Design a protein around this ligand. Structure first.
Ligand SMILES: NC(=O)C1=CN([C@@H]2O[C@H](COP(=O)(O)OP(=O)(O)OC[C@H]3O[C@@H](n4cnc5c(N)ncnc54)[C@H](OP(=O)(O)O)[C@@H]3O)[C@@H](O)[C@H]2O)C=CC1
Ligand code: SF4
Ligand code: SF4
Ligand code: SF4
Ligand code: SF4
Ligand code: FES
Ligand SMILES: [Zn+2]
Lengths: 74, 118, 61, 78, 86, 125, 694, 69, 57, 77, 123, 77, 49
C-alpha cells in the first residue's frame, strides 16, 4: 500500500485550532487534511514543492499571474 | 451572514446565497447539508467565483404545499400524473390512495393530496 | 403485438415459456457409449429383461 | 510472450482471483519527470451489485433433446 | 516473585492424558485454594488440549509446565515445583 | 504438506500472502426472503483492513477505497476446493461453518388440539 | 419413525405426520410459499404451495397436507404451473404499483415468484380500479403501507404465538379484511422487528431505514450481536462507511431466526455521538489532541502520580471484546496491579459465585435445553428484558409441553404464566424447601435460572449458597447427564471477563484508586472514581464515562472489529468487521499495546495471531468458536465456589429489584440512539396505546 | 451555441417543424417557478462549483464535561 | 446528451430514489443517497453523475 | 449468442430491422475501410466523398437509437 | 510462416532440475552481459553494477524453490523479461519498476516499530 | 437484477464486415456472464501480417494494413 | 395490417435432426480414437470433444 511519509501521525491539530484527520493510505485519492498556499508555485522550487504536497492530498492553493505558466501543476 | 471557518477566520456570504433554495431557507432532510456547512467546508473552491450564477433551483417541498387539496366522493382516490396534452404515458404508475381517515393523504410519487369531501 | 401472445383467454405463459424449455447439454463419457454399443438404445434395444438387464447395465456403469 | 498487457505487467487478468481494477495504477511524477507505477487508490470504490442476485432458482431443468438412439435402454419390466 | 497471583489449569474433559489432573482438581482444589488464599485459581476445559498449568507471579511474569503424568501425586509435585521455581 | 506454491507464479502482490486474511463461508439464508438459491455456493472474501477500506472524498462525497480486494468474491462448489485454492495461493483463512435450520415435525392439526386445562393462549389462525 | 415417499421421482424419507413441504425441502425440491414459515404455525391461505398428489383429485397444499407412506407427488406438471399462475394473478389483482417506492424491492418474494412461477403480463384492466387500504400507526419502529398486504398472517401468528402480543389481528371480512389493531394501538414488544423480516412484502418495514438503501448496494457481513449475552447471530448490511441495518441470522442453538429491537434498531447510535479524535481535559473543557499527545499525557500522569500496586484500576464495561480485556489485564498486571474490575454496582469485589469453574457463571443447561424443560425457577431475572429471545424460547416450550414456571423476584409482565411466589430471600428458601422444591425434585429437566442482578447485590453469597445447597442436595438439578444451575448474564463481556480472570483481589477491593482506566465503562456512578484520580476512558461513544474522563481515547465499535465474544452458554463467537472505525479511532488492543509501550512496560504480542495465541494461553475455549463445551466438574464447582465461602453472608430483607429499568437505553450505543429514545418515550406502560383494557 | 434558448436549440437542428413562437399553449411546459436561462459559464467566475449535498455520515461527539461529585 | 432531473407541473421533483438508474448504469456513473423527507416523502438527498464516467447510453 | 442461450425467438420485424441495419453498418464499414485504404495509399478525395454518405447513414442510426455511433439498439431479444 | 523474434526461446519444460540449472545459469549470464545495453537503451541514472546487483537480487528471490514446474514457469517468465528488455520494447517507465531504491527518499516517517504504525494507523 | 440465462455455452458468429466475428459465452445460470471471449476478425489478420508482408517493400505494408481493415478496439478488445 | 399473426414455436425444435447427426458423428470419432476422446457433448448444433 501507499504511505503518508510526510506525516508522523494521522490526527494532526494545527496551532490555530483545526483538527486534521488524514484519510486514506497516502496516495492520490488520499487527503492529509492540510491546506497550503505556495506563492511562487509557478517557478523552479515551487513546482517541486507543490508536487510533493499534492502527492499526498494536501490542498494547495496556487496564486498565479500568468494563466499559462501554471498548467503543469494541476 | 458571516460564517466562522475551521481555522478561526470569517467567511462572509450574502443572505441570498445561504438559503437552501430561493423559496426555502432551511433544509428538508436530516442528512442534507446546509449552505453554511457547504461553504465552511468548500470555500477554497468558491473563493473568486460568482454565486450569482451557480445552480439554485426551487425546492419542491414548498411548491407542492401550494397545490390545493383534491376532493373525491368515496374511499379511494386514483392518481396518475399524466400530461393529457401529449401522447404516451408521461406520468407515474397508477396509484390508489385511501382517504377514509380524517386528514389529507398524499401520493407516493407526486405529493398531490386527497381528502374525503370533508 | 401478435395474436396468440396478446390473447387474454387461452394463453397460459407456461405453454410459451421457451426459456425454461431449454435443451439440456448431453454429455457422453466412454462408459455411456459402450452401453449404447454392448447393449442397444431405446430405439434398438439389445438388452435382457428384468433385473438381468438392470445389472447388465450396472456392469457397464 | 504477452500480447495484450503492459510490458511489465505482473499478473494474469482473467483469473477469478485477479481483481477487476488490478493492483497498480499510473501517474506522471513531476519530481522524477516520469510515468510512475504506484499502488491503487480509487476516488470512487467499485460497487459490485452482485449481492442482488436472485434468491429463487430462475430456470429449472431443461428439456431432454437426446435422440432415442443415444438414450440407454430401459430393460422391459418382466 | 513476591507471590503467586494467578494459577490456570488447562485440561481436556475425556482425554487419557488429563485424568490425573482431573482427579487433582476434583480432590485437592480446596486445599490448594486454602494454601494459597490470595491467588486466582482458574480451571478451564476444552476438548483436545494437552494438560498444562500456568502460574503468574508478579509484573506479569508467567511460567508453565505440562502435566502429562500418570498420577495425582506427580501433578501435585509438579505444581509445587512451578510455584516454588518462581 | 507438499502443496505447490502457485503464489510464486501468480504475479500477485506478496501482501496477500503475508498480511491478509480471507473468510470461506456459505451465504446465510436471508431473513428477508424464503429463497435459498444464493446459498449452496462457498464464497471466498477478503477481510477488511481499516486504513484502506472506505473514506469519503472532500470534493463531491464519493466513498474512496485503497483496498483492491474489497469487491472481489470467488465462488466455489465445496469447502475443500476453496481450501485447496487458498493454500495454493498462500492465503490464511478462517472457515465459517454453516448453521442449518433444525428439523421439527409440523402439523396443521396441532393448531386445533384439545386443551384439557386452562387455555395457554387463544390462537387467531 | 421415518416413512418413504416419492417426490418428482426422487425417494425421500422423513418422520410421519410431517408436512409435504418439509419433504420437498429435504429432497431439494423447491416449492413456492408466502404464508408458510418453518417457525410459525401452518396457515394455508396463500394457496401457492399447491402440488399434485396421485391420491387426491384436486391439487393439495404442501404446507398442510400430511406426509403419508407410498404417496407420489409431482411439482412439475401443467396443473401445478397453471395453479401458480392463477394464484399470482389473483394476488397481484389488487396489489399496488409501489415497487419503486417500496423498501422490499430487490428482496421481495412476490417479485421473484411472479417472475419465476407466474405470468409475464396481467389481464386486470378494470376501470373501477384496485382496492385501497389505510395505513396504520403501530409505533415508531414498524412503518405501514398496508395496500401491499397480501394477507399471509405471518405477523399475527408471530405476535400472538412467539411474542405474546395479541394486539395484532385480522379485522373485517372478505376483500375489506384488514390486518392491524382495530383501534389505534402500538405493537408493544421487544421482538417487534422480526415482523419486518417475516412479511414477504413491504407492508411492514423499518422506519429509521425507510428509504436509505437498496439491497444490492449492501455488503453483507455475518457477525455477532452485542447488547445482550445471548450472542445472537446477525447480518450487518453496510453501504460504505455507514452501517444501514442489522437483521437476524439462523442459529438454532442461540437465537433461532430472531433478534430483539435493541439489537436491530440501536445501529442508529453508531453514527452519532461517536468519538473520532482523542481529547484532553484542560479544565471544564475538552481539547482535541493527537495520539502522541494523549499517550504522553497518560504516561506523565503515571509518573507524576506513582500509583503503587493496586492503585491502578482497570474497569471493563459491556460491549467490550475479550482481546481488549486480555490486553488491559496484562498491562494492569505488568504495572503491578490486580484491581481488574467490572462496571457493575458491586464490581469492585469479586463475584460471590466465583470464577474458578466456568459452570458457576454460565447457562449450563444450554439455550436449546430450555426446550427440554419441565420446570423452571426464575431467581432475580426478567428474561423479557434480559435475553428476550430466551424468553421467546421459554414461551415456545411452555406452549407445547407441560412446563411449570415459578419466579422469586419482582412481579414481571411475562409472556407466560409464571406463578409468582415472592420477592425476598426468605421466600426463596420457603419455595425451595416447600412446594416448588418438590416440583423441581420430581422433574427430569429442571432449570434454576439466576440473574446477574443477584451478583450485583451485597448479600449474593446468601442466595448462591442456598441455590448451591439445593442443587447438590437434589439429583435432578445436577446429574451426569444434565446441569440445571444456570446464571443468566445481561451483558456480552461478563462471561469472557470471568473466563480470562478479569476480577479483583480483596487486597485491591479495599484500595482507593489513583488511576482509573475505564474501558467501554459507561455505568459508573461518579462515586466509584475519586475526584483526585487520573481517568482514561476508552470507547466509541460519548455518553457517561467520557464526561468524567481526563483523557479520552477513541476506539472501535462491534461493527468495526473482528472480536471474540462469549455468551451465556460459554459459546465463543467471532465477529467480522463490516467497516473501519471512524476518523482517528483505532482497535482497542492496539491502543493498549501502544500505551503499554509508552508506559514502562510492553505486551509481548504485536498482531492478531499473537493475540489469539495469548487467548489460547489464557483459556483454550476462547478459540473453539461456536462450540458449547460440557463440563466434568459440576459437583466440584457447586461444592467449592457457591456453598463453601458464602455461609458467612447473612441475607438482607431488601426486596429484589428489577435490574434493567429500561430495556431500551441500556448501553452507550443505545443511549446514543434517537430511535431508542423514541421507543422509550413510546412503549411506556403509562401510555394508552400500550395497554389494552381487557 | 450555449446562448441559444432551448426550444430553438431543437428547432435549430430540425427536430420540430414548429418554433416555440408558434407552438400551441398546451404543448408548452407548465412551470410553477420562474424561468431563468443561463448559458455555459465555463472559463468565468460563474463556472459550476460541485459539492456534496450531504453531510458526513458519522456525526462526532460535541465534548461536554461533568464533575465528580 | 446532457442529463437533467425533471419535475411535475406541481413543481415537485419526479425522482423517488428507487435506484434503478444507479443499478442499470454500465459505467457506475450515478451515485444516489436518500432518506425520508420532512413531509414523509421518498426523495433524494444526493444525486450525482460523473459525466467523465458516463457513456450516454 | 444470448438468444441462443435463452432459447427465445426474435420477431420477424426485429429480424428485418437487424438485417437492414446490419447492411447499413456494412456500408459504413466499407466506406471507412476502402476510403481509408485509398487515403493511406494516397487518394484523398474518396475519403471525403464517402464520409458524407456516412453522415447520411449516421442520421438513420441517430433517428433509430439516439446515437450517431454507439447505438445500443440491437439487444438480446 | 510466423517466425519468432530476435531473442525468442521455444517453450520447453525441462524434465530435470539439472538441465534447468544450466538454462537458468545461461539466462543469468545473458542478463549480466546485457546490462550495459539496458543502461544505454534506457537512460539510466545509475551504475551498471547496480543493474547487475538487481539482477542478482531477483535471481536470489527464487533460489530455494524446489518444485520443478514452478522453476520452469519462472525460467520462462525470466526469458520473457529478457526479451522485453534487450529488444527495446519496454520504455524507461516500465524498466524502472525494478529500481525503486534509486529514486530519492520517500519522506521522513517510514515506520519500522509498533507505535509509529499505530500513530499512522498501519498496525 | 437482470434476466437469468440458462447454464451452458455457445460460440456463434456472424459475417461482420471485417470477417467472421464471434462470441464464446459461458453462462453459469446467473444474470452475469462467467466468460465472454470475442473472436475479433482483425486479431487473426494482424497475426497473419508476418506471413503476408514478408518479401514486400514498406509502401506495400501500408496497403496490406489497409486491406486487412484493422480497427484496433477489436484487435485488442 | 389489422392483426399481426406470429406462431409460437420453440427455437430448439429446429435443431433435432442435426443434433442426432452430430451425436452419430461424435460416436464415430470416439470409436476411431478411443485412446484420446474422453467424451463428447452436444447442444444446439455445437459439438464439443
Ligand atoms: N534559484 C536559486 O538558485 C535560488 C533561489 N532563491 C530564492 O528562493 C525562491 C526560489 O525561486 P526560484 O526557485 O529561483 O525560481 P523562481 O525564482 O523562478 O520563482 C519565482 C517565483 O516568484 C514569483 N514572482 C516573482 N516576482 C513576483 C512578483 N513581483 N509578484 C508576484 N510573484 C512574483 C514568480 O512568479 P512568475 O513565475 O509569475 O514570474 C515565480 O513563481 C525565491 O525566493 C528566490 O529568490 C534563493 C537562493 C538561490
Ligand atoms: S411488496 Fe414487493 S411487489 Fe409489492 S410493491 Fe413492494 S417490492 Fe413491489
Ligand atoms: S401485514 Fe405483512 S406479514 Fe402481515 S399478513 Fe399482511 S403481508 Fe403478511
Ligand atoms: S432513482 Fe433514478 S430511476 Fe429512480 S426515480 Fe430517481 S432518477 Fe428515476
Ligand atoms: S452512462 Fe449515462 S445514460 Fe448510461 S446509465 Fe450512466 S448516466 Fe445514464
Ligand atoms: S404455503 Fe401453503 S397455502 Fe401458503
Ligand atoms: Zn400521483
Amino acid at each position: 500500500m501507499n504511505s503518508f511519509e510526510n506525516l508522523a501521525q494521522d490526527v494532526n491539530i494545527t496551532r490555530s485550532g483545526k483538527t486534521l484527520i488524514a484519510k486514506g493510505t497516502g496516495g492520490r485519492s488520499s487527503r492529509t487534511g492540510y491546506t497550503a498556499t505556495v506563492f511562487g508555485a509557478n517557478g523552479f522550487l515551487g513546482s517541486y514543492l507543490t508536487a510533493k504536497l499534492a502527492k499526498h492530498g494536501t490542498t494547495v492553493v496556487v496564486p498565479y499571474r500568468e494563466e499559462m505558466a501554471k498548467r503543469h501543476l494541476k | 451572514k458571516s460564517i466562522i471557518s475551521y481555522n478561526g477566520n470569517t467567511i462572509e456570504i450574502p443572505e441570498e446565497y445561504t438559503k437552501q433554495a430561493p423559496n426555502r431557507d432551511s433544509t428538508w432532510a436530516p442528512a442534507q447539508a446546509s449552505k453554511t456547512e457547504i461553504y465552511k467546508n468548500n470555500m477554497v473552491r468558491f473563493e473568486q467565483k460568482d454565486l450569482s450564477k451557480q445552480p439554485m433551483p426551487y425546492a419542491g417541498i414548498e411548491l407542492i404545499a401550494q397545490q390545493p387539496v383534491r376532493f373525491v366522493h368515496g374511499n379511494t382516490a386514483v392518481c396518475d400524473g399524466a400530461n393529457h396534452n401529449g401522447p404516451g404515458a408521461q406520468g407515474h404508475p397508477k396509484i390508489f390512495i385511501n382517504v377514509d381517515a380524517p386528514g389529507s393523504h398524499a401520493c407516493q410519487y407526486c405529493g398531490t393530496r386527497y381528502e374525503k369531501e370533508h | 403485438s401478435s395474436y396468440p401472445t396478446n390473447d387474454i383467454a387461452e394463453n397460459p405463459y407456461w405453454k410459451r415459456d421457451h426459456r425454461r424449455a431449454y435443451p439440456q447439454t448431453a454429455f457422453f463419457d466412454q462408459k455411456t457409449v459402450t452401453g449404447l454399443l454392448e447393449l442397444g438404445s431405446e430405439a434398438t434395444p439389445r438388452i435382457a429383461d428384468g433385473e438381468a438387464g438392470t445389472k447388465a447395465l450396472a456392469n457397464i456403469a | 510472450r504477452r500480447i495484450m498487457t503492459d510490458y511489465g505487467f505482473e499478473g494474469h487478468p482473467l483469473r477469478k482471483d485477479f481483481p477487476l481494477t488490478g493492483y497498480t495504477e499510473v501517474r506522471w511524477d513531476e519530481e522524477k519527470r516520469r510515468v510512475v507505477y504506484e499502488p491503487l487508490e480509487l476516488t470512487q470504490a467499485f460497487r459490485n451489485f452482485s449481492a442482488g442476485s436472485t434468491a429463487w432458482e430462475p430456470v429449472g431443468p431443461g428439456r431432454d433433446d437426446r435422440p432415442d438412439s443415444f438414450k440407454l435402454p430401459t430393460p422391459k419390466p418382466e | 516473585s513476591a507471590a503467586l497471583r494467578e494459577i490456570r489449569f488447562h485440561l481436556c474433559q475425556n482425554g487419557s492424558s488429563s485424568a490425573p489432573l482431573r482427579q487433582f482438581v476434583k480432590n485437592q482444589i480446596g486445599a490448594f485454594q486454602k494454601a494459597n488464599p490470595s491467588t486466582k485459581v482458574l480451571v478451564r476445559e476444552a476438548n483436545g488440549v494437552k494438560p498444562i498449568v500456568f502460574a503468574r507471579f508478579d509484573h506479569g511474569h508467567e511460567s508453565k509446565i505440562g502435566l502429562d503424568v500418570s498420577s495425582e501425586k506427580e501433578v501435585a509435585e509438579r505444581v509445587k515445583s512451578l510455584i516454588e521455581a518462581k | 504438506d507438499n502443496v505447490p506454491a502457485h503464489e510464486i507464479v501468480s504475479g500477485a502482490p506478496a501482501e496477500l500472502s503475508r498480511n491478509r486474511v480471507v473468510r470461506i463461508y456459505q451465504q446465510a439464508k436471508p431473513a428477508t426472503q424464503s429463497g435459498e438459491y444464493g446459498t449452496f455456493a462457498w464464497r471466498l472474501d477478503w477481510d477488511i483492513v481499516d486504513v484502506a477500506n472506505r473514506w469519503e472524498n472532500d470534493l463531491i462525497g464519493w466513498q474512496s477505497s485503497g483496498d483492491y480486494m474489497q469487491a472481489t468474491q470467488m465462488k466455489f462448489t465445496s469447502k475443500e476446493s476453496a481450501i485447496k485454492f487458498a493454500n495454493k495461493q498462500g492465503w490464511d483463512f478462517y472457515i465459517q461453518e454453516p448453521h442449518h435450520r433444525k428439523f421439527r415435525v409440523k402439523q396443521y392439526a396441532n393448531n386445533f388440539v384439545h386443551s384439557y386445562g386452562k387455555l395457554k393462549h387463544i390462537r387467531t389462525k | 419413525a421415518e416413512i418413504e415417499l416419492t417426490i418428482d421421482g426422487h425417494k425421500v424419507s422423513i418422520e410421519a405426520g410431517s408436512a409435504l413441504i418439509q419433504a420437498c425441502e429435504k429432497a431439494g425440491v423447491t416449492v413456492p410459499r408466502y404464508c408458510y414459515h418453518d417457525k410459525l404455525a401452518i396457515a394455508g391461505n396463500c394457496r401457492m404451495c399447491l402440488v399434485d398428489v396421485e391420491r387426491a383429485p384436486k391439487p393439495v397444499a404442501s404446507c398442510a397436507y400430511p406426509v403419508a407412506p407410498g404417496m407420489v407427488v409431482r411439482t412439475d406438471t401443467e396443473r401445478v404451473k397453471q395453479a401458480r399462475e392463477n394464484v399470482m394473478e389473483m394476488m397481484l389483482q389488487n396489489h399496488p404499483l409501489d415497487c419503486p417506492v417500496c423498501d422490499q424491492g430487490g428482496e421481495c418474494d412476490l417479485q421473484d415468484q411472479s417472475m419465476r412461477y407466474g405470468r409475464d403480463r396481467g389481464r386486470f384492466t378494470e376501470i373501477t380500479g384496485k382496492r385501497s387500504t389505510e395505513d396504520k400507526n403501530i409505533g415508531p419502529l414498524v412503518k405501514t403501507s398496508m395496500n401491499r398486504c397480501i394477507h399471509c398472517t405471518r405477523c399475527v401468528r408471530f405476535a400472538n404465538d412467539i411474542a405474546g402480543a395479541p394486539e395484532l389481528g385480522s379485522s373485517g371480512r372478505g376483500n375489506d379484511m384488514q390486518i392491524g389493531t382495530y383501534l389505534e394501538k402500538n405493537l408493544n414488544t421487544e421482538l417487534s422487528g422480526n415482523v419486518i423480516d417475516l412479511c414477504p412484502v413491504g407492508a411492514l418495514t423499518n422506519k429509521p431505514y425507510a428509504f436509505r438503501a437498496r439491497p444490492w448496494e449492501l455488503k453483507k457481513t455475518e457477525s455477532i450481536d452485542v447488547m445482550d449475552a445471548v450472542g445472537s447471530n446477525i447480518r450487518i448490511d453496510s453501504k460504505g462507511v455507514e452501517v444501514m441495518r442489522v437483521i437476524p441470522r439462523v442459529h438454532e442453538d442461540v437465537n433461532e431466526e430472531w433478534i430483539n429491537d435493541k439489537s436491530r434498531f440501536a445501529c442508529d447510535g453508531l453514527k452519532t455521538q461517536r468519538l473520532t479524535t482523542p481529547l484532553i481535559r484542560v479544565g471544564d473543557k475538552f481539547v482535541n489532541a493527537t495520539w502522541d499527545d494523549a499517550l504522553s499525557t497518560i504516561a506523565k500522569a503515571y509518573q507524576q502520580k506513582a500509583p503503587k500496586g493496586d492503585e491502578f484500576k482497570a474497569v471493563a464495561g459491556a460491549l467490550v471484546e475479550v482481546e481488549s480485556m486480555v490486553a488491559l489485564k496484562d498491562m494492569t498486571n505488568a504495572l503491578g496491579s490486580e484491581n481488574t474490575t467490572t462496571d457493575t454496582p458491586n464490581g469492585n469485589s469479586a463475584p460471590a459465585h466465583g470464577i474458578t469453574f466456568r459452570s458457576n457463571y454460565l447457562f449450563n443447561s444450554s439455550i436449546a435445553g430450555i426446550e427440554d424443560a419441565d420446570a423452571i425457577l426464575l431467581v432475580g431475572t426478567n428474561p423479557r428484558r434480559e435475553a428476550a429471545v430466551m424468553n421467546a424460547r421459554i414461551r415456545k416450550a411452555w406452549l407445547r409441553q407441560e412446563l411449570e414456571i415459578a419466579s422469586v423476584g419482582p412481579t414481571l409482565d411475562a409472556t407466560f404464566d409464571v406463578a409468582e411466589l415472592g420477592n425476598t430471600h426468605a421466600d426463596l428458601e420457603k419455595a425451595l424447601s416447600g412446594e416448588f422444591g418438590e416440583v423441581l425434585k420430581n422433574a427430569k429437566n429442571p432449570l434454576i435460572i439466576v440473574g446477574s442482578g443477584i451478583t450485583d447485590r451485597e448479600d449474593a453469597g446468601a442466595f448462591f449458597n442456598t441455590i448451591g445447597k439445593f442443587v447438590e442436595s437434589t439429583p435432578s438439578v445436577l446429574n451426569e447427564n444434565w446441569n440445571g444451575y444456570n446464571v443468566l448474564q445481561r451483558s456480552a463481556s461478563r462471561a469472557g471477563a470471568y473466563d480470562i480472570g478479569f476480577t479483583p483481589s480483596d487486597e485491591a477491593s479495599k484500595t482507593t484508586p489513583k488511576m482509573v482506566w475505564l474501558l467501554g465503562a459507561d455505568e459508573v456512578a461518579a462515586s466509584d472514581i475519586p475526584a483526585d484520580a487520573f481517568v482514561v476512558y476508552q470507547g466509541h461513544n460519548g455518553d457517561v464515562g467520557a464526561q468524567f474522563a481526563d483523557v479520552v481515547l477513541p476506539g472501535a465499535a462491534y461493527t468495526e472489529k473482528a472480536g471474540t465474544y462469549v455468551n451465556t452458554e460459554g459459546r465463543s463467537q467471532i465477529s467480522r468487521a463490516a467497516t473501519g472505525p471512524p476518523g482517528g479511532a483505532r482497535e482497542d488492543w492496539k491502543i493498549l499495546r501502544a500505551v503499554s509501550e509508552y508506559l514502562g512496560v510492553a505486551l509481548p504480542y504485536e498482531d492478531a495471531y499473537e493475540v489469539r495465541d495469548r487467548l489460547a494461553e489464557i483459556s483454550p475455549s476462547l478459540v473453539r468458536y461456536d462450540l458449547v463445551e460440557p463440563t466434568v466438574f459440576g459437583d466440584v464447582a457447586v461444592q467449592h465456589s457457591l456453598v463453601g465461602p458464602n455461609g458467612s453472608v447473612t441475607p438482607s430483607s431488601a426486596p429484589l429489584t428489577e435490574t434493567i429499568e429500561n430495556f431500551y437505553m441500556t448501553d452507550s450505543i443505545s443511549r446514543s440512539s434517537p430511535t431508542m429514545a423514541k421507543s422509550s418515550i413510546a412503549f411506556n406502560k403509562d401510555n394508552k396505546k400500550n395497554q389494552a383494557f381487557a | 451555441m450555449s446562448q441559444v434558448e432551448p426550444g430553438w436549440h431543437f428547432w435549430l437542428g430540425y427536430g420540430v417543424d414548429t418554433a416555440p413562437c408558434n407552438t400551441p399553449k398546451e404543448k408548452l411546459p407548465i412551470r410553477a417557478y420562474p424561468y431563468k436561462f443561463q448559458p455555459n459559464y465555463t472559463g468565468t467566475p460563474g463556472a459550476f462549483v460541485t459539492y456534496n449535498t450531504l453531510k458526513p455520515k458519522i456525526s462526532a461527539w460535541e465534548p461536554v464535561t461533568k464533575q465528580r461529585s | 446528451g446532457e442529463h437533467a432531473l425533471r419535475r411535475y407541473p406541481s413543481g415537485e421533483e419526479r425522482c423517488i430514489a428507487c435506484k434503478l438508474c444507479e443499478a442499470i448504469c454500465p459505467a457506475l456513473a450515478i451515485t444516489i443517497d436518500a432518506e425520508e423527507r420532512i413531509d414523509g416523502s421518498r426523495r433524494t438527498t444526493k444525486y450525482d453523475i460523473d459525466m467523465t464516467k458516463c457513456i450516454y447510453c | 449468442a444470448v438468444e441462443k442461450l435463452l432459447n427465445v425467438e426474435v420477431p420477424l420485424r426485429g429480424k428485418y430491422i437487424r438485417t437492414m441495419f446490419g447492411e447499413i453498418t456494412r456500408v459504413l464499414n466499407h466506406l471507412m475501410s476502402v476510403c481509408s485504404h485509398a487515403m493511406d495509399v494516397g487518394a484523398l478525395t474518396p475519403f471525403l466523398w464517402g464520409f458524407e454518405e456516412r453522415e447520411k447513414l449516421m442520421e438513420f442510426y441517430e433517428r433509430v437509437s439516439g446515437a450517431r455511433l454507439h447505438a445500443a439498439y440491437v439487444r438480446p431479444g | 510462416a510466423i517466425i519468432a523474434t530476435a531473442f525468442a526461446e521455444t517453450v520447453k519444460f525441462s524434465g530435470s532440475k539439472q538441465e534447468l540449472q544450466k538454462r537458468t545459469l545461461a539466462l543469468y549470464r545473458q542478463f549480466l552481459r546485457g546490462a550495459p545495453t539496458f543502461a544505454d537503451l534506457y537512460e539510466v541514472q545509475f551504475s551498471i553494477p547496480t543493474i547487475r546487483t538487481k539482477i542478482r537480487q531477483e535471481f536470489e528471490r527464487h533460489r530455494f524453490v524446489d518444485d520443478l514446474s514452478i522453476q520452469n514457469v519462472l525460467y520462462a517468465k525470466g526469458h520473457m523479461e529478457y526479451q522485453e528488455c534487450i529488444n527495446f520494447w519496454k520504455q524507461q517507465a516500465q524498466f524502472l519498476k525494478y529500481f525503486p531504491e534509486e529514486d530519492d527518499i520517500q519522506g521522513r516517517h517510514q515506520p519500522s516499530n509498533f507505535v509509529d504504525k499505530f500513530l499512522k494507523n498501519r498496525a | 437484477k437482470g434476466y437469468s440465462v440458462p447454464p451452458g455455452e455457445t460460440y456463434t458468429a456472424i459475417e461482420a464486415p471485417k470477417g467472421e466475428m464471434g462470441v464464446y459465452v459461458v453462462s453459469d445460470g446467473s444474470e452475469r456472464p462467467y466468460k465472454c471471449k470475442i473472436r475479433a476478425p482483425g486479431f487473426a489478420h494482424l497475426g497473419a501480417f508476418d506471413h503476408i508482408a514478408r518479401g514486400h517493400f514498406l509502401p506495400d505494408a501500408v496497403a496490406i494494413i489497409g486491406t486487412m481493415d484493422l480497427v484496433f478496439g477489436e484487435v485488442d478488445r | 395490417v389489422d392483426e399481426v399473426y406470429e406462431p409460437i414455436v420453440n427455437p430448439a425444435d429446429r435443431y433435432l435432426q442435426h443434433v442426432s447427426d452430430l451425436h452419430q458423428y461424435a460416436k464415430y470419432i470416439m470409436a476411431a480414437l478411443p485412446k484420446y476422446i474422453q467424451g463428447f457433448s452436444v447442444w444446439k448444433d455445437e459439438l464439443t470433444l
